[PDB]
Amino acid sequence: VSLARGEQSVKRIKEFDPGKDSFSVLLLGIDARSDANVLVTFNRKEKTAKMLSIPRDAYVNIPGHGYDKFTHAHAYGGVDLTVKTVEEMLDIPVDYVVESNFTAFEDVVNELNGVKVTVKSDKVIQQIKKDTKGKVVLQKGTHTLDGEEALAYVRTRKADSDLLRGQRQMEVLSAIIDKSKSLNLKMNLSLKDAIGLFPFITSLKSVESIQLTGYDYEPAGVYYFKLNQQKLQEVKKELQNDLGV
């Protein structure tokens, strides 16, 4: 990619250099709706990562389109709109964005000879059996799943919910990081710069996750996830403090 934005984010008031400043990455998974939406803020002064899944049904203002589901942003305007939708939603810059489909996720999980996940629910195992028609049969405990098994894990929903599918997505993402330590992707980032970021991204001191508290909002059948505005301001201030903005 190459964002229809310029060099650095519009949200950044002062000049930005990624090799020295705290930054943010927006990972998007598309089969065009964006079904995986994970924002990660990397704090360089403290060597930490903060993850957060944006619910695909989040009642947000898509620029030039009004209030809608968050997932529709990528449908209405692709990458550039999603970033825009995020940048207005959280009042923070989206410095980097990576976009992947199923096969890219599968092939990177396989290139690492699997990612390790600790499955703890017979419910999710049963639903994955039913989803894959028996092709993917997970086990309770800590195991190394291949690309197909990882994708089935991050895709299932009916056992728990989509909001927990986001937490499963963040889990598998951090597992991918872990497995990469021992050593169809579209990026607004030269591969060389990604490799330059690789050591810092594989040497954090701690990683934390964030949730967005909200409530079901069903006007005339269509489902939306309305965000608790107080917790939203809280998370916005936290991310701004993390990024130094």
Annotated domain spans of the chain: 1-101+184-245, 102-183
Exposure pattern of 149-163 as b/e (b: 16+ CB <10 Å)? bbbbbbbbeebeebb
How many CB atoms sit inside 10 A of residue 141's CB? 9
**Residue appearing with tokens 């990624």:** 18
- Among 232, 224, 227, 228, CA closest to 69: 224
Chosen CATH of 1-101+184-245 out of 2.70.98.60, 1.10.260.40, 3.30.420.590, 3.40.50.300:
3.30.420.590
- Close Cβ partners of 7 (under 8 Å, ≥ 6 residues apart): none
Scan for tokens 């195992």, then name that residue.
125
State phi, psi for 161 to the nearest 5 degrees: -160, 180
Task: Report the residue numbers after which the chain has a gap, meaning the C atom sits over 2.5 angstroms from the next written residue's N, or none.
Answer: 31, 183
Q: Which residue has the tokens 């107080």?
A: 230
The resolution, in angstroms to one decimal, equals 2.8
> What single-letter amino acid sits at 105?
F
Q: Of the candidates 160, 172, 162, 158, which has an alpha carbon nearest to the alpha carbon of residue 109? A: 172
Q: Distance between CA 243 and CA 16 in Å, rounded?
A: 11
Which residue do the tokens 């996940």 mark? 117
CA neighbor of 209 nearest in space, from 235, 228, 229 = 235
List the structure tokens of 146. 């291949």
Tokens found for residue 36: 């995986």
Give, as one character, the DSSP assignment of residue 58: B
Paired strand residues for 53: 38
Round to the nearest angstrom and report the end-to-end CA distance of the chain: 25
Name the strands in the sheet holding 23-29, side by side, starting at the edge strand that comes first in the sequence: 186-187, 96-100, 23-29, 36-43, 48-53, 206-210
CB–CB of 70/37 below 8 Å?
A: yes
User: How is 141-185 classified by DSSP, letter by letter?
Assistant: EEEEE-HHHHHHHHH--TTS-HHHHHHHHHHHHHHHHHHHH----
Specify the amino acid at residue 225: F
User: How wide is the angle at C-alpha 83 spanned by C-alphas 77 and 85, nearest 5°?
Assistant: 75
Which token pair is 150?
């990882």
Assigned CATH for 102-183: 3.40.630.190
Q: How many whole angstroms separate alpha carbon 232 and alpha carbon 126? A: 35
**Placement of tokens 């299932």 in the chain:** 156
228 by DSSP, 3-state: which?
Answer: coil
Using CA atoms, how far apart are residues 144 and 112, in angstroms rounded to an integer? 10
Among 200, 198, 154, 194, which residue's Cα sits nearest to residue 1? 194
CA 221 to chain centre: 27
Task: Identify which of 165, 137, 203 has the alpha carbon closest to the alpha carbon of residue 71.
Answer: 165
- The residue assigned the tokens 């990562």 is 49
- CA 175 distance to own-chain centroid: 13
User: Does this chain's domain 1-101+184-245 share its CATH topology with 102-183?
Assistant: no
Which pair of structure tokens corresponds to residue 73?
Answer: 């942003």
